[PDB]
Design a protein. Structure first.
Length: 63
């Protein structure tokens, strides 16, 4: 799922996190279960980035 995940990242303006998501093989299904502690674990060190992603999945899969 690098198709919807890079489109998702681009939508949040977090295109630079692509390499992490590819390396760690993170799909949107994987991401949907990840909170702050899990994203810290894969190298997303900025609170604001993790916040953007977490809220980003909520909008995407709850609307």
């Amino acid at each position: 799922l690098d198709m919807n995940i890079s489109q998702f990242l681009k939508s949040l303006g977090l295109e630079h996190l692509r390499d992490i998501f590819e390396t760690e093989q993170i799909t949107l299904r994987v991401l949907a279960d990840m909170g702050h502690e899990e994203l810290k674990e894969i190298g997303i060190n900025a609170y604001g980035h993790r916040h953007k992603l977490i809220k980003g999945v909520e909008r995407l899969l709850g609307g």
